[PDB]
Amino acid sequence: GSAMGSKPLRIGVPNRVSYTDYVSKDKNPPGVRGYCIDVFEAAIELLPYPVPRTYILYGDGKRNPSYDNLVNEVVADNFDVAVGDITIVTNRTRYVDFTQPFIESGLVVVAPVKEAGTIEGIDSLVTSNEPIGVQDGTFARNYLINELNILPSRIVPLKDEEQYLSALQRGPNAGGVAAIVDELPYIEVLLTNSNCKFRTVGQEFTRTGWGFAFQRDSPLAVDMSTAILQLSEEGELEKIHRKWLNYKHECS
Amino acid sequence: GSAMGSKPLRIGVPNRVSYTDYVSKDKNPPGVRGYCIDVFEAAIELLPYPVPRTYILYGDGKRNPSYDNLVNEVVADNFDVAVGDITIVTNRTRYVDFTQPFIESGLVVVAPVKEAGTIEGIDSLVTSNEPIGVQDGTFARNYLINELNILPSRIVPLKDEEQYLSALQRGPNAGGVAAIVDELPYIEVLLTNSNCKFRTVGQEFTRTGWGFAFQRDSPLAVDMSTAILQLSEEGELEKIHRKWLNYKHECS
Ligand SMILES: N[C@@H](CCC(=O)O)C(=O)O
Ligand SMILES: N[C@@H](CCC(=O)O)C(=O)O
Numbered sequence: 001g002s003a004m005g006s007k008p009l010r011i012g013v014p015n016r017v018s019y020t021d022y023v024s025k026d027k028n029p030p031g032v033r034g035y036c037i038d039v040f041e042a043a044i045e046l047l048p049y050p051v052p053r054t055y056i057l058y059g060d061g062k063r064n065p066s067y068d069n070l071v072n073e074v075v076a077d078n079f080d081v082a083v084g085d086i087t088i089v090t091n092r093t094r095y096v097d098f099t100q101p102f103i104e105s106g107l108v109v110v111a112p113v114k115e116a117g118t119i120e121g122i123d124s125l126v127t128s129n130e131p132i133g134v135q136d137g138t139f140a141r142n143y144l145i146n147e148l149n150i151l152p153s154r155i156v157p158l159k160d161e162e163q164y165l166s167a168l169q170r171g172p173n174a175g176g177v178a179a180i181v182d183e184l185p186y187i188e189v190l191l192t193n194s195n196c197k198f199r200t201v202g203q204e205f206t207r208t209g210w211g212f213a214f215q216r217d218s219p220l221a222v223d224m225s226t227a228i229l230q231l232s233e234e235g236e237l238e239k240i241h242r243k244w245l246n247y248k249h250e251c252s
Numbered sequence: 253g254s255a256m257g258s259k260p261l262r263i264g265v266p267n268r269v270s271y272t273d274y275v276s277k278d279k280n281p282p283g284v285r286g287y288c289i290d291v292f293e294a295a296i297e298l299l300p301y302p303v304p305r306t307y308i309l310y311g312d313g314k315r316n317p318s319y320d321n322l323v324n325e326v327v328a329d330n331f332d333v334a335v336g337d338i339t340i341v342t343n344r345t346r347y348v349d350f351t352q353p354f355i356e357s358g359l360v361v362v363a364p365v366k367e368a369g370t371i372e373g374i375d376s377l378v379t380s381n382e383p384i385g386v387q388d389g390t391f392a393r394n395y396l397i398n399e400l401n402i403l404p405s406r407i408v409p410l411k412d413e414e415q416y417l418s419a420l421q422r423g424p425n426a427g428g429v430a431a432i433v434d435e436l437p438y439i440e441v442l443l444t445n446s447n448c449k450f451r452t453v454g455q456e457f458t459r460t461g462w463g464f465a466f467q468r469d470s471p472l473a474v475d476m477s478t479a480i481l482q483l484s485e486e487g488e489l490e491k492i493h494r495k496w497l498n499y500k501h502e503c504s
Pocket of ligand 1: 064065067068085086087088135136137138139140183
C-alpha cells in the first residue's frame with residue numbers, strides 16, 4: 001500500500017514487417033518507433049497526469065499480426081491499450097473504447113497502369129472473379145467477404161513490399177493478383193517506392209480512421225481523445241506526419 | 253414502478269437558419285429533418301433495443317445557436333444527447349462522449365475568384381489584417397482567435413446565405429469581408445448556389461468531423477458509434493448524403 005507503487009500501462013503494439021514507418025520494433029528503448037508511437041507519446045505529454053507505461057510487441061515478426069486479435073487482447077485484459085495503425089471498424093468498437101481518429105483512412109484498389117482499362121475500381125474487381133491481394137492480419141479480408149461478397153478463395157494474403165510488388169507485376173494469370181485492396185496510408189507509401197507502374201483505380205470506397213484502443217469506460221481514452229484533437233488543432237499531427245511520411249518519388 | 257413507464261431520450265437539435273439540408277426544424281413530426289437526423293434515425297434502427305426519443309429545437313430561430321452551449325446543455329443534463337452538425341473539438345470532448353464521426357469536416361477559406369491573388373489561403377488571410385466572415389455559433393470564432401492569433405474585432409458573424417454572399421461581394425473595403433472561414437460541408441453548399449463567383453483558396457487547414465454528443469459514460473454512445481460504422485461499411489452513410497446533398501450547379 002504505502003510501499004507498493006503503481007502498475008504501468010501494458011501497451012500492445014503490432015510487430016509490423018511492412019510499412020514500418022507507421023509503427024515497428026526498435027532495437028533501442030522504448031522498443032517501438034514510428035508515426036503512431038510519436039502521436040501516442042505527444043498525446044500522453046498533453047495529459048494533466050503522468051502515465052507510467054511499457055510497450056509490448058504483438059506478432060511473430062514474420063507476418064503482420066491479426067489486428068482483430070490485438071484489439072481482443074485489450075478486451076481480454078492482456079493489454080490496457082493497443083497503440084498503432086489500428087483501423088476503427090464495427091466489430092472492434094463493440095468491446096473497446098477507441099479514441100477519436102488521429103488519421104483518416106479507407107480502402108482503395110491498386111492495379112497496374114496497363115490493367116486500368118479492365119480493373120477500374122472495386123465494382124469491376126468484384127465481378128472480375130480474379131485474385132485480390134491484401135496484407136496479413138487486416139480487417140479488409142472480412143470486409144471484402146461479408147460486405148462486397150468476394151469468394152474467400154480469391155483473397156490472397158501477401159507478406160511484405162516485395163510480395164505486394166511481385167503479385168501486382170505477375171498479375172492474375174501467373175500466380176499473382178489482378179489488384180491489391182488496402183488502406184490509402186499504406187498505398188501512399190507503396191506508390192512512392194514502385195516506380196509509377198501501379199496506381200489507385202476508382203474512388204476510396206470506405207472511410208474510417210486509425211485510433212488507440214482502450215478498455216471499455218477507460219477515463220484515459222476520453223483524455224487521449226481530447227489530446228489528439230489538441231494535437232490536430234495546434235498543427236502537431238501534420239508535423240509528426242511530415243517527420244515520418246514523405247510521398248514524393250523520382251517519377252513525380 | 254409497475255405503472256410508471258420509461259423517460260424518453262431528450263435530444264437537443266440546433267435550430268439552423270442556414271444550410272438547413274444538414275439539420276433544421278420541420279412543421280411535421282418528428283419536428284426536425286435533414287442529413288444529420290436521417291443518420292441518427294438509421295443508427296437508432298440498427299440498435300438491438302428500442303430508444304423512445306423526443307427532439308427539442310435549440311436556438312431563437314433568428315441566428316444559428318452557440319454549438320458550444322448546445323453541447324454544455326448535454327453536460328448540464330438538460331439534454332441526454334445533442335444531434336446535428338456538431339463539430340468534434342477539444343473543449344467539447346472534455347465533458348461529453350461524442351460518437352465516432354459520421355462525416356469528415358475541416359475549415360476552408362472562401363474568397364472571390366478576383367481576390368485569389370492576395371488572399372490565397374489561411375496564412376495570407378491572417379497577415380492581411382482584413383475582416384473575416386464566420387457563421388453565428390461556430391467553434392471557428394475561438395479557433396481563429398486562440399489558434400491562428402486573429403484580433404477578435406476582425407471576426408464578423410454573418411446570419412444566413414444572403415449575408416455570406418453579400419459580405420463576400422461587398423468585400424473588405426465596403427462593409428464586407430476579405431474571406432469566409434467555415435467548414436467544407438457548408439461551403440460545398442455555398443459554392444453550389446453562388447454562380448462560380450467564389451472558390452476555396454489554399455488547403456483545408458483543420459480536420460475533424462461531426463458526431464452525436466452523449467453524456468459521459470453513456471452506453472448509448474458506444475452502440476451508436478458501432479451503428480455509425482455499420483452504416484458507413486454498408487454504404488448507407490453515402491446513400492443518406494446523396495439524398496440530402498447534391499453539389500452539382502449550372503456553371504459546372
Ligand atoms: N490497419 C489494419 C492492419 C493492417 C495489416 O493487416 O497489417 C487493421 O487495423 O486491420
Ligand atoms: N458545426 C459548427 C456549427 C456551425 C454554426 O455555427 O452554425 C460547430 O459545431 O461549431
